[PDB]
Design a protein around this ligand. Structure first.
Ligand SMILES: Nc1nc2c(ncn2[C@@H]2O[C@H](COP(=O)(O)OP(=O)(O)CP(=O)(O)O)[C@@H](O)[C@H]2O)c(=O)[nH]1
Ligand code: MET
Ligand SMILES: [Mg+2]
Lengths: 267, 95, 470, 117
RNA sequence: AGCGCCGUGGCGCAGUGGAAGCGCGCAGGGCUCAUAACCCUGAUGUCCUCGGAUCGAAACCGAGCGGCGCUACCA
């Protein structure tokens, strides 16, 4: 069963942003379902629909598909939402769609777990998802940390640890990327021995390649040597590559040549 | 369906290469020349000539540089004439 | 049903193959035509000159078969800066029965000692007359330095003149004059376009060619009708190369030297660094025989400016790791042939335009870098390479103090400033260092019509030397 | 002896103008009478002319109003820089490929030229 | 050669993960006395190729093809 909210409460809050799907347009506008919050209806009448003049009615609404949305008023008695689409700036729409993408992605994994264990999705959101969104600002970042760090789950009360185990499995299978850190070293030598210096330099550099993080200095050009590695925490590659820089400078400051840094380590 | 008209001893078929301003046209005559033609009377502002359409143009004995359009073929008498072969058939013009 | 490659391999083993050079042969008895020398190295440097966009790499590729690459995106089509190279082995048939004009046959460097005669009905085998190197020189107005450097490297010359186009092309005249400057009096003339010309138009072109070459130092240069694309009349050109060019006097007595003209870095991308190669100086050796395991230093070397702006020169010492010539790795290298000296010199020191025009000395000699060079110069009366629309040719003006002139001392590309001008003598101060060994043939050019134009000749007789820092 | 014969063979361009539509039905004849594949000729047509069209059967249909003057001019320019070799007056040259750039090469002589832009 | 990309419905873009997308095109009718602007509605695609994970790939990735921008012709 696919249902349940993505955020804390069921009702949208005042002056927030959502992204809604359109299904139907009767006369005054489109009262449509929301895909960022829950599944209730909320209306956009024609005055707050098109920023441009109201020329194309069906072309800009495209019944059946999704679009950014902004909530103006909430009726917290029955489930009626007043909503608009003109009033989302060009800067805003991108963060709107990013938040929707994140909320949609976090939904499917817990959907799988709920289907497998026959637990209501509401329960999974209440137990694991909502405290993660409180801890980390958002649950997808919580799952990204869960791939890296097992501690983010410590403090949550699962409905069953089997949910935890199969969720570990499905997150490791589904959410798997380890960003590549690359850099560029400029060899500016005018010296006597430089080839053997480079051989020793890469020997020292690749000797630091760990089991989980492997550094290779590929050749693309004579002065420009490109350094490639895969950092899983995105916080060790910089230091290992600065270690490679220290190695290369120590090697070539005594053979007689000069070497310089063009592009430091970066994601 | 009005009957077509054939050529007579100084009036020859041509093709508008491109129509000129102020009431003139340039007609590639089917003799090898890119002559200049005037849109005549009886034909000025009732039968509109479109660029790329076979026409009849009267030569003038005392000017071979310029001539004057006479009759227009609405691409049907034109295709029939091409079938009969009243013009050099290398320059085939059709819709 | 034998594959073509199997047939070629069998012909190669039957043809004598490619011998391996003895590791220590008796040197004073080594002549430039000896088998240990001739079957694996090019001993005579042969160059091609002409106006832009007529085809010189085309002629050389038709002759030998080794392509000149013509690299660098934009430079695949318009012009090239580096020289083009190609190894040609000149083979002549031993059989007197086959007529002499088609006896000769030029082949690639990989060919055997004695390939069979491809003329139908001729069972005799070929004999290697001589191995020659080809120095393709970009004939453009913008590019002056490399032409003069190669002409210094050159030993004999081939001038190319087109048929249908104008007869007195000025670039051909300029290159012929530059060749006359640097003591090269062996040139053979080729008419590149004859197929598109009539029997009388070709005769008129030949008469114009003869009319052009009357006041030049070279007088009896043979003239050859050739086809670059049609690939015909090459055996005759091989015959003319054999006959009109003998071996320049060159023995092993002279002290060792070298002149780097191009600079190659051996760094194949994609491969791991644990398996690399050294840096290569592409050099002409006009004197000295170099072996494996020889220490050699690039005299002008590292050019630096101190905090005061003074010029310091750190000579580039180097151990020779390999001497690659022609096709195979060879122990000894014959002076008078383009060779890649692959030393342990830093690969970035040899990236593209670093070792171009630089003198190098083997251990046991100390050439001197000069800051001041006083020259004995001489000029011509009219410029070459300029097309005047029906008027007098541009007349060379005398030198002015404090002026930048392109002075090519052999290969060394330097832009000198004039301190004073005399009746026959001048003084030049150089920004980029140049070293002098004996005299070195020098060419002079100035900037008048935008780009450099050759003016005359000069020779260093004295100068101020800078003792290198070791 | 080798070439006792030693182009005046360009087809008369039949531009077939159907109102807002244009038909070049002879395009196969030009493509075979200049030894160029019709694909490259159509690409050059849609490079000099900023439109798009369909190929049917051999024939090119482009919904646009255009004169035989400009078709003839573009054909002549293409022949000048593609069909006709610049170094030698010949038509035997054909389109081939030498790393990834298009390198048309000659057959009558064997030259190495490039015309791609 | 390696890298940074790309692989289209006629052309251009796009998400890549739930699986045919929009404008520009063009055909048709609509407004108009009438044309253009503008309305609306269509018939067409191996989202390049082989695989592997996946409930699911056009999408995540590899092993390959073609087109590219550099690095640079890199004995
Ligand atoms: N008809 C004809 N074309 C030739 C002949 N020789 C060369 N060509 C052509 O002329 C053109 C120029 O060839 P190319 O070798 O690149 O000239 P280049 O010497 O490298 C240019 P630069 O003189 O500045 O160095 C080529 O297309 C070539 O095929 C010839 O003998 N006859
Ligand atoms: C004489 S072979 C060409 C020059 C150098 N040996 C490289 O290779
Ligand atoms: Mg060249």
């Amino acid at each position: 069963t696919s249902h349940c909210r993505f955020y804390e409460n069921k009702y949208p809050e005042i002056d927030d942003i959502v992204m809604v799907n359109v299904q139907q347009i009767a006369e005054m506008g489109a009262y449509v379902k929301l895909l960022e919050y829950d599944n209730i209806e909320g209306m956009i009448l024609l005055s707050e629909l098109s920023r441009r003049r109201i020329r194309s009615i069906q072309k800009l609404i495209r019944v059946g598909k999704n679009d950014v949305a902004v909530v103006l008023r909430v009726d917290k008695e029955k489930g009626y939402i007043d909503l608009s689409k003109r009033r989302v700036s060009s800067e805003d729409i991108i963060k709107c769609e990013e938040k929707y993408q994140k909320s949609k992605t976090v939904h499917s994994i817990l959907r799988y777990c709920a289907e497998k264990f026959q637990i209501p999705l509401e329960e999974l959101y209440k137990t694991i998802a909502w405290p993660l969104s409180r801890k980390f600002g958002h649950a997808y970042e919580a799952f990204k940390l869960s791939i890296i760090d097992e501690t983010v789950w410590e403090g949550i009360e699962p409905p069953s640890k089997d949910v935890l185990d199969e969720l570990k499995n499905y997150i490791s299978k589904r959410l798997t990327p380890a960003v590549k850190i690359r850099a560029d070293v400029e060899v500016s030598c005018f010296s006597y021995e430089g080839i053997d210096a480079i051989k020793d330099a890469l020997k020292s550099a690749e000797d630091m390649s760990t089991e989980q993080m492997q550094v290779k200095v590929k050749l693309v050009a004579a002065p420009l040597y490109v350094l490639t590695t895969q950092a899983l925490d995105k916080q060790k590659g910089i230091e290992q590559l600065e270690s490679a820089i220290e190695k290369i400078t120590e090697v070539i400051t005594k053979y007689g040549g000069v070497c310089n840094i063009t592009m430091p380590p970066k994601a | 369906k009005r009957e077509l008209i054939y050529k007579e001893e100084g009036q020859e078929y041509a093709q508008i290469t491109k129509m000129l301003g102020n009431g003139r046209v340039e007609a590639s005559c089917f003799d090898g020349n890119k002559r200049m033609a005037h849109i005549r009377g009886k034909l000025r502002k009732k039968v509109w000539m479109g660029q790329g359409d076979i026409i009849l143009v009267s030569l003038r004995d005392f000017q071979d540089d310029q001539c004057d359009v006479v009759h227009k073929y609405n691409l049907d008498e034109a295709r029939t004439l091409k079938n009969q072969g009243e013009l050099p058939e290398n320059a085939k013009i059709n819709e | 049903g034998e594959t073509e490659e199997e047939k070629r391999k069998r012909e190669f083993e039957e043809g004598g193959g490619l011998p391996e050079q003895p590791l220590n042969p008796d040197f004073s008895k080594l002549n430039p035509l000896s088998a240990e020398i001739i079957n694996r190295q090019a001993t005579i440097n042969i160059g091609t000159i002409g106006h832009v966009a007529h085809g010189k790499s085309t002629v050389v590729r038709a002759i030998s078969g080794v392509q000149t690459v013509r690299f660098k995106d934009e430079l695949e089509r318009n012009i090239t800066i580096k020289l083009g190279y190609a190894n040609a082995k000149i083979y002549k048939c031993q059989e007197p029965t086959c007529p002499e004009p088609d006896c000769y046959r030029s082949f690639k460097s990989d060919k055997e000692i004695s390939p069979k005669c491809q003329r139908p009905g001729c069972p005799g085998r070929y004999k290697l007359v001589r191995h020659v190197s080809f120095v393709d020189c970009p004939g453009h107005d913008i590019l002056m330095s490399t032409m003069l450097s190669g002409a210094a490297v050159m030993d004999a010359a081939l001038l190319l003149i087109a048929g249908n186009e104008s007869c007195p092309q000025p670039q051909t005249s300029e290159h012929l004059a530059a060749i006359e400057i640097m003591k090269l009096k062996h040139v053979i003339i080729l008419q590149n376009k004859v197929d598109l010309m009539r029997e009388e138009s070709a005769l008129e072109h030949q008469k114009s060619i003869l009319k052009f070459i009357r006041g030049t130092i070279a007088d009896g240069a043979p003239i050859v009708p050739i086809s670059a694309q049609l690939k015909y009349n090459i055996d005759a050109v091989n015959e003319f190369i054999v006959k009109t060019i003998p071996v320049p006097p060159r023995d092993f007595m002279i002290s060792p030297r070298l002149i780097v003209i191009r600079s190659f870095d051996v760094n194949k991308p994609g491969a791991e660094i644990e398996d690399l190669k050294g840096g290569v100086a592409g050099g002409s050796i006009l004197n000295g025989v170099f072996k494996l395991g020889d220490e050699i230093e690039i005299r002008p070397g590292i050019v630096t400016k101190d905090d005061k702006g003074k010029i310091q020169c750190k000579p580039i010492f180097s151990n020779i790791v390999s001497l690659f010539a022609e096709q195979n790795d060879l122990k000894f290298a014959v002076p008078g042939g383009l060779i890649g000296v692959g030393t342990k010199v830093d690969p970035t020191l040899c990236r593209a335009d670093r070792l171009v025009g630089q003198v190098v000395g083997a251990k046991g000699h100390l050439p001197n870098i000069y800051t001041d060079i006083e020259i004995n110069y001489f000029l011509l009366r009219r410029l070459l390479g300029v097309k005047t629309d029906g008027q007098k040719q541009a007349k060379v003006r005398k030198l002015e103090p404090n002026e930048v002139l392109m002075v090519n001392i052999g290969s060394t590309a330097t832009g000198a400033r004039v301190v004073a001008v005399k009746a026959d003598m001048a003084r030049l101060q150089l920004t980029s260092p140049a070293c002098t060994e004996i005299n070195e043939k020098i060419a002079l050019s100035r900037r008048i019509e935008k780009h450099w134009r050759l003016i005359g000749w000069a020779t260093i007789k004295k100068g101020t030397t800078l003792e290198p820092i070791a | 002896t080798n070439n006792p014969e030693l182009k005046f063979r360009i087809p008369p361009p039949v531009c077939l103008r159907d109102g807002k539509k244009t038909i070049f039905s002879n395009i196969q004849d030009i493509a075979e009478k200049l030894h160029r594949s019709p694909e490259h000729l159509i690409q050059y047509l849609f490079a000099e002319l900023g439109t798009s069209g369909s190929v049917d059967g051999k024939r090119l249909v482009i919904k646009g109003k255009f004169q035989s003057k400009q078709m003839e001019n573009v054909l002549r320019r293409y022949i000048l820089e593609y069909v006709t070799c610049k170094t030698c007056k010949s038509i035997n040259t054909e389109l081939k490929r030498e790393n990834r750039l298009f390198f048309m090469v000659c057959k009558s002589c064997g030259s190495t030229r490039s015309v791609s832009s």
